[PDB]
Amino acid sequence: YSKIKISGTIEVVTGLHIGGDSPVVRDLQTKLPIIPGSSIKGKMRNLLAKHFDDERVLRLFGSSEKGNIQRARLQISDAFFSEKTKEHFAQNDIAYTETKFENANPRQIERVTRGSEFDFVFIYNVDEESQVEDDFENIEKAIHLLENDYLGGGGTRGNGRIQFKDTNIETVVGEYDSTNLKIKAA
Ligand SMILES: [Ca+2]
Helix, strand or coil, X not given: CEEEEEEEEEEECCCECCECCECEXXXXXXXXXXXXXXXXXXHHHHXXXXXXXXXXXXXXXXXXXXXXXXXXXXXXXXXXECHHHHHHHHHCCCCCEEEEECCCCCCEEEEECCCCEEEEEEEEEECCHHHHHHHHHHHHHHHHHHHCCCCCCCHHHCCCCEEEEEEEEEEEECCCCCCCCCCCCC
C-alpha cells in the first residue's frame, strides 16, 4: 500500500463556464472561481469509458452502480485558482472573469478567462502494485482526452478548453517508488 500525489496546473485555454443569471462556481471562502473535482472526474471517466463499464475505468474512478461497488483508486480534488494567476492578473490588470450574452431573451453567462490557472491535486491509492503503470498510462490517456474535449457548458461552440501542465508525481505515503511514473503531455 501507498498513496501517490499527482499535482500541477490546469490552464484555461478558452472561456470556462461551470455553474453552481449564470455565475461560475466559486470557492465559498475566497469567492474565487473553482474547478470542482467532480467536473474533472466526470469528464475523465466518461471520455476514458468512451475511448475503450470496463475494469480499467472502474478501478480508477470507482462505481456506485447497483451490484458492483468498487472503490476508486483515483481521488480528484477541486482545482483552486492559483496564487500566480492572482499576482499576475492583478499587476497586469487582466480580467479573471467576464460576462457575455449567449449565442430580453439572451442569457447572461459568466466565464473564467483564458490564461487563468488552477492548482490541481489527484491522489492515487496503490491498491495493486502490479497495476500502477497501466493505471498511470490510463490517467495520462484520460487527461489527453480531456484536453481534446472540454469542461463545463458551451463545449460544442468552442468553450471550456483546458490544458494540463507542470505536473509532478510524488509518493506521499508508503514506499512505492513513483520516480519512473510520468504523465507525458500531448
Ligand atoms: Ca517524482
